[PDB]
């Protein structure tokens, strides 16, 4: 019915956005109404970790601890809503913005825009303080 | 010799109406220094690289507009304007991420070099990525990176 | 802020509050905040402490709750409780409640629209300057030519 | 000489020697509207040429 583990929904194939058809078919088999929660923010800010907490799990969306970017594209986890019977909670984990090894800088805008369009709740993840750059 | 320390108003104040004054303070810090300390938190962000790129180009353009009327401009020939930009010191505060890239441990200096390294080639796929880095490579040949733990 | 303690929500609202006045010195400041006020009427802010000792951040998901900061464990629970209690079912125009198939349709519609060029790109601030100034340079050169030929 | 540099560059900034780039929505409008004129002209040229 639901997913035991998250899957990649949208891949960065070369430098073009491509949808994973397996994840789409599992998502379209989902018959219940969906509450869709997406996270977005700079890379290396603990987004993936926080999304696993919304799934109520210690592991799920992959977490790494190097200076390099980890999460790529957009990953989807369709889980039961923990309080509403007959509703589905969808978690969308995103590639982090501002990757200094990423050539396709415009893909950051594309992932952000998709996260806004596909969600009902948008989690903007920043570090330390409210920055003017983050507002802009 | 006299050591001269310049402490600056921080960029990105969300209560500051004059957002263009941030570029002015940044440009003045580049123009007046011999060593430029760029202070960042946790990691090297693309926004920090692009801001340094943008301000450096604006700073070179302002300096060019105050050279042909300046008698202090006339005292040299062959040295480009880039040769008088300050040395670059990149500080990483509250540093906690593993200094490892592609399975290899790296120094903070190698981490800075990897972040600012232009991708090889000449294609359209690389032009946007290499544009700030070609500038930073040109105007800041001498770089140094330092990490600082959470204190 | 200004000698008064504020909540995280009051801190977020203060940062995003538009300045009163309507004058030119406030236009740039008010531009992002008028948009954010319009597109996101319902806002919430959450603070999270540093989650553990800095040497144990790399293994954070493997640690038990007593090795983390206690305030962080509580703050994560409060965040998760708020998301579960206040998040709505996704809607579309015409009173339509989004389910799996409709969400799949939205993914395909927007991915295809991005791949066909419907989404604008945010350019580098230097290339943007060159585009403006060089276009103005062509117009000045043409105006000079027209003046010289017309005389 | 450093005093001279401070006065020289502060005056140059104060007189407009530092370029100023405008915001987001106006910059987007400038790009998209210029492209819109070109698309409209291309459509006109196609219709008249046929
Ligand atoms: N400083 C800090 N580090 C965290 C926090 N949460 C997770 N981390 C660590 O930060 C690193 C990157 O986390 P990750 O989930 O991959 O960040 P993401 O790239 O935004 O998804 C991991 O090693 C985590 O253990 C936090 O709240 N603060
Ligand atoms: Mg991650």
User: In three state form, how does the secondary structure of chain C look?
Assistant: CCCCCCCHHHHHHHHHCCCCCCCHHHHHHHHHHHHHHHHCCCCCCCCCCCCCCHHHHHHHHHCCHHHCCHHHHHHHHHHHHHHHHHCCCCEECCCEECEHHHHHHHHHHHHHHHHCCCCCCCCCHHHHHHHHHHHHHHHHHHHHHHHHHHC
Q: A120, C88: Cβ pair inside 8 Å?
A: yes
Do B56 and B30 touch, CB atoms closer than 8 A? yes
Q: What is the position in ligand 1's atom list of the atom closest to the CA of A70? A: 19
Name the neighbours of D, counting chains with at least 3 Cβ pairs within 8 A.
Answer: B, C
Size of interface B-C (CB pairs under 8 A): 37
Distance CA B117, CA B133 (A): 7
A91, B23, C84, C95 from A81: Cα distances, Å: 11, 47, 8, 22
Helical H runs in B5-122? 21-32, 46-64, 108-115
Phi-psi label, residue B142: left if phi above 0, alpha if psi -120 to 50, beta otherwise: beta
A130, B9, B15, C6, C19 from C3: Cα distances, Å: 19, 20, 15, 9, 20
Burial class (CB in 10 A: 0-12, 13-18, 19+), A119: buried
Task: Please choose, from the candidates B29, B56, B75, the residue with its C-alpha nearest in 3D space to the C-alpha of residue D5.
Answer: B29
Secondary structure (3-state) at A71 = coil
What is the B149 CA–ligand 1 centroid distance (Å)? Answer: 16
Nearest CA in chain D to C29: D23
Distance CA C109, CA B82 (A): 48
Distance CA B97, CA B108 (A): 11
For B115-130, b where at least 16 C-beta lie within 10 A, e where not — what string? bbeeeeeeeeeeebbb
Answer positive or negative: Cα dihedral of A4, A66, A121, C114. negative
Written as six digits, the tokens of A82 are: 């923990």
Answer positive or negative: Cα dihedral of B22, B25, B29, B30. positive
Written as six digits, the tokens of B99 are: 């200094």
Please tell me which of the candidates D21, D25, D32 has its beta carbon nearest to residue C128.
Answer: D21
What is the A70 CA–ligand 1 centroid distance (Å)? Answer: 11
Written as six digits, the tokens of A16 are: 């073009």
Please tell me which of the candidates D2, D10, D19 has its beta carbon nearest to residue B61.
Answer: D19
Answer positive or negative: Cα dihedral of D16, B134, A94, A64. negative
Residue minimizing CA distance to atom 27 of ligand 1:
C51
Q: B41, A66: Cβ pair inside 8 Å?
A: no
CB within 8 Å of C74: residues ≥ 6 apart: none
B15, B17, B27, B111, B132 from C132: Cα distances, Å: 29, 25, 21, 35, 19
The resolution, in Å, is 26.8
Q: C100, A29: Cβ pair inside 8 Å?
A: yes
Distance of CA A124 to the CA centre of its chain: 11
A77, A110, C112, D21, D26 from C117: Cα distances, Å: 28, 11, 9, 25, 20
Please tell me which of the candidates B16, B54, B150 has its beta carbon nearest to residue C125.
Answer: B54
Secondary structure (3-state) at A50 = helix
Euclidean distance between the first and the last CA atom of chain A, given in angstroms as a whole number: 40
With a Cβ cut-off of 6 Å, ligand 1 is lined by A 43-49, 63-65, 70-71, 96; C 48, 50-51, 57-58, 60
Distance CA C72, CA C123 (A): 38
Nearest CA in chain A to C124: A105
Q: Report chain C residues whose CB lies below 8 A from the CB of B18.
A: 25
Secondary structure (3-state) at A29 = coil
Name the neighbours of C, counting chains with at least 3 Cβ pairs within 8 A.
Answer: A, B, D
Residue of A41, A63, A115 with the most ligand 1 atoms within 8 Å of its CB, for mutation: A63
What is the A63 CA–ligand 1 centroid distance (Å)? Answer: 7
Task: Please choose, from the candidates B120, B86, B99, B105, the residue with its C-alpha nearest in 3D space to the C-alpha of residue B44.
Answer: B99
Task: Please choose, from the candidates B42, B77, B38, B61, the residue with its C-alpha nearest in 3D space to the C-alpha of residue B135.
Answer: B61
| Percentages of chain A per state (helix, strand, coil), in multiples of 5 | 25, 30, 45
DSSP symbol at D25: H
Q: What is the position in ligand 1's atom list of the atom closest to the CA of C60? A: 25
Q: A133, B47: Cβ pair inside 8 Å?
A: yes
Answer positive or negative: Cα dihedral of C34, C35, C39, C42. negative
Q: What is the position in ligand 1's atom list of the atom closest to the CA of C54? A: 1
A8, A16, A118, A122, C102 from C111: Cα distances, Å: 14, 10, 11, 19, 14
Euclidean distance between the first and the last CA atom of chain D, given in angstroms as a whole number: 70
Distance CA B136, CA B44 (A): 14
Task: Please choose, from the candidates B151, B136, B147, the residue with its C-alpha nearest in 3D space to the C-alpha of residue B55.
Answer: B136
Do C118 and D35 touch, CB atoms closer than 8 A? no
Judge whether C35 is closer than 8 Å to chain D, CB to CB: yes
Please tell me which of the candidates D21, D23, D32 has its beta carbon nearest to residue C31.
Answer: D23
Distance from CA of C101 to the nearest CA of B (A): 35
Q: What is the position in ligand 1's atom list of the atom closest to the CA of A45? A: 20
Way it was determined = cryo-EM
Distance CA A65, CA A57 (A): 18
Which DSSP helix (H) or strand (E) runs through B89?
strand B87-93
Distance CA C18, CA C31 (A): 9
Distance from CA of D17 to the nearest CA of B (A): 5
Burial class (CB in 10 A: 0-12, 13-18, 19+), A15: exposed
Do C92 and C103 touch, CB atoms closer than 8 A? no
* Paired sense of beta strands B143-147 and B100-101, if any: unpaired
CB-based contacts of B32-38 (< 8 A; 24+ apart in sequence): B32/B6, B32/D2, B32/D5, B32/D6, B32/D9, B33/B6, B33/B86, B34/B86, B34/B87, B35/B86, B35/B87, B35/B89, B36/B85, B36/B86, B36/B87, B36/B88, B36/B89, B36/B140, B37/B89, B37/B91, B38/B88, B38/B89, B38/B90, B38/B91
């Amino acid at each position: 019915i639901h997913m035991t583990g998250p899957m990649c929904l949208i891949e960065n194939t070369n430098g073009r956005l491509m949808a994973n058809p397996e994840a789409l078919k599992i998502l379209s088999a989902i018959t219940q109404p969906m509450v869709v929660v997406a996270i977005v923010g700079l890379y290396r800010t603990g987004k993936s970790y926080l999304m696993n907490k919304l799934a109520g799990k210690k592991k799920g969306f992959s977490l790494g601890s190097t200076v390099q970017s980890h999460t790529k594209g957009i990953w989807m986890w369709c889980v039961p809503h923990p309080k509403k019977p007959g509703h589905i909670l969808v978690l969308l984990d995103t590639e982090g913005l501002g990757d200094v090894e990423k050539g396709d800088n415009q893909n950051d805008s594309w992932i952000f825009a998709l996260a806004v369009l596909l969600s009902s709740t948008f989690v903007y993840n920043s570090i330390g303080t409210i920055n003017q750059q983050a507002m802009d | 010799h006299i050591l001269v320390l310049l402490d600056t108003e921080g960029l990105g104040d969300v209560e500051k109406g004059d957002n263009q004054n941030d570029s002015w303070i940044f440009a003045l810090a580049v123009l007046l220094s011999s060593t430029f300390v760029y202070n960042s938190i946790g990691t090297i962000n693309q926004q920090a690289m692009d801001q340094l790129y943008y301000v450096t180009e604006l700073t070179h353009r302002i300096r060019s507009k105050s050279s042909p009327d300046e008698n202090e401009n006339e005292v040299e020939d062959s040295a480009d304007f880039v040769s008088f930009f300050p040395d670059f010191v990149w500080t990483l505060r509250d540093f906690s991420l593993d200094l490892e890239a592609d399975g290899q441990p790296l120094t903070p200096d190698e981490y800075l070099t990897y972040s600012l390294k232009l991708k090889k080639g000449t294609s359209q796929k690389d032009e946007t990525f290499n544009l700030p880095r070609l500038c930073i490579r040109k105007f800041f040949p001498k770089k140094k990176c330092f990490v600082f733990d959470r204190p | 802020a200004d000698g008064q303690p504020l909540t995280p929500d009051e801190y977020l609202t203060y940062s995003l509050k538009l300045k009163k006045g309507t004058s030119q010195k406030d236009e740039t400041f008010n531009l992002p905040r008028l948009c954010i006020r319009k597109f996101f009427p319902k806002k919430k802010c959450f603070v999270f402490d540093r989650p553990v000792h800095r040497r144990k951040l790399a293994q954070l998901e493997k640690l038990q709750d007593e090795e983390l900061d206690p305030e962080f464990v509580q703050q994560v629970a409060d965040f998760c409780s708020y998301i579960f209690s206040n998040s709505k079912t996704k809607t579309l125009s015409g009173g339509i409640q989004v389910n799996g198939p409709r969400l799949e349709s939205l993914v395909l519609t927007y991915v295809n629209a991005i791949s066909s060029g419907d989404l604008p790109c945010m350019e580098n601030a230097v290339l943007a300057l060159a585009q403006i100034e060089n276009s103005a340079a062509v117009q000045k050169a043409i105006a000079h030519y027209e003046q010289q030929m017309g005389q």
